[PDB]
Amino acid sequence: VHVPLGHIVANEKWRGSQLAEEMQGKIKLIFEDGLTPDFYLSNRCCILYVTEADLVAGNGYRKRLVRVRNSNNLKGIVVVEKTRMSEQYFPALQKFTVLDLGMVLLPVASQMEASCLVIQLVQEQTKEPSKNPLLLSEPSLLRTVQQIPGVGKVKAPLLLQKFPSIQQLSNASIGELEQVVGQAVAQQIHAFFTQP
Amino acid sequence: TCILVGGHEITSGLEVISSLRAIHGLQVEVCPLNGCDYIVSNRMVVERRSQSEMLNSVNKNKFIEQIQHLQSMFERICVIVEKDRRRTKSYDSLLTTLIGAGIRILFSSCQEETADLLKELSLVEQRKNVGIHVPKSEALQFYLSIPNISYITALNMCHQFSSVKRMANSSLQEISMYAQVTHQKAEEIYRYIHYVFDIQML
DNA sequence: TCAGCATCATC
DNA sequence: GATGATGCTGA
Ligand SMILES: [Ca+2]
Ligand SMILES: [Ca+2]
Ligand SMILES: [Ca+2]
Ligand SMILES: [Ca+2]
């Protein structure tokens, strides 16, 4: 389906719905018949809207989720009406949708809530993925060296001055360790690195 | 399967933990996880969050920072949004942000439900061959200090490396295999253990 | 030999 | 998450 930027393609059955009317006062809706999903947010990303009556009716809604899931060129987002009436049927739907099919699931209480949430999704979809806030080792090396038995804040920097990487420190003989620490601590360090 | 539980969840999710223990064939280990609520596989963390805390936008920043810290350690993240014992723009924005970064979201009505979701996640992780398959403590503390390594990856290191020296001289591919981590993660660990320390850089 | 150093238990 | 009280380290 062709979805121009800043537009939502909606299934014709949504015409005159509160959902469509609330969206149409914020973003351009294009209506199209013969569509499996309820809305397309982009060419490849679509919405499958599961009503309170679908959820209470049984598992018939699953057939469509499977049909979209098995589409190579499409990513389905499931938006479900989770209300006082439907909520007992929600847990089995979430298991199937998210844990079985691996599809995104979003509950809403109402078409009014869905409208805000769908706009948020278009807004997310439209920005540069780099504006998604989710999309020097020396102080750490000191702390790592401090985990070696016998080695505190004073011996750690002395050890790293002479054996400058973990690998090199790991390979040091007792004789070489004895250039930096005493025999007891040289023995602790070496045992720490080499014991099974 | 095995799930690791952050010690701090004994305060906030006592019933999650007892519900987990009530599931036959689940090994439940509570551990000092440092922030992580649940570890459900070698590669996946779960953040349990109250819905009323997700709804308030003064928490939005702290929540984002906790997810950033989780991304530095784990390849996969799930958020479970749990109802406490009106829906906002901040909340919607959080949900979509999570979706854009591929963070999985689940919705729970109670602590008993959360446990059942955690169990289900570990079962699915298992079938993806990333199940936790491991049970000295000095060596664990050492591995745990490697930056951006998870508690499970550190435990894998303890259990699969016959000595600490053997681990420090491991190739990139050995770290990846024995620590059970992505190529990217094994590279970061390899670079750390090879990093040439220079004092004047402090 | 004796401060220096690491360590951890107790604020 | 900090002292600092306690006993090992070390040439
Ligand atoms: Ca037509
Ligand atoms: Ca130490
Ligand atoms: Ca010496
Ligand atoms: Ca939490």
Q: How does this model look, in words?
A:
The complex is a heterodimer of chains A (196) and B (202). Chain A has 196 residues and is α/β, with parallel strands linked by helices. Chain A folds into 2 domains: 1-131, Rossmann fold (3-Layer(aba) Sandwich); 132-196, DNA polymerase, domain 1 (Orthogonal Bundle), CATH 1.10.150.20. In chain A, 43% of the residues lie in helices and 15% in strands. Chain A is elongated, with a radius of gyration of 30 Å. Chain B has 2 domains: 1-135, Rossmann fold (3-Layer(aba) Sandwich), CATH 3.40.50.10130; 136-202, DNA polymerase, domain 1, CATH 1.10.150. Chain B is 50% helix and 15% strand. Chain B has 202 residues and is of the alpha/beta class. Chain B has 11 helices and 6 strands. In chain B, strands 2-1-3-4-5-6 form a 6-stranded mixed β-sheet, sandwiched between helices. The chains are: A alpha/beta (196), B alpha/beta (202). The interface between A and B is large, with 54 and 51 residues. The structure holds calcium ion (CA) (4 copies). One calcium ion is lined by residues 33-34 of chain A. The structure holds a DNA duplex (11 and 11 nucleotides). Chain A: It is found in: Nucleus. Chain A: This is Fanconi anemia core complex-associated protein 24. Chain A: Belongs to the multisubunit FA complex composed of FANCA, FANCB, FANCC, FANCE, FANCF, FANCG, FANCL/PHF9, FANCM and FAAP24. Interacts with FANCM.
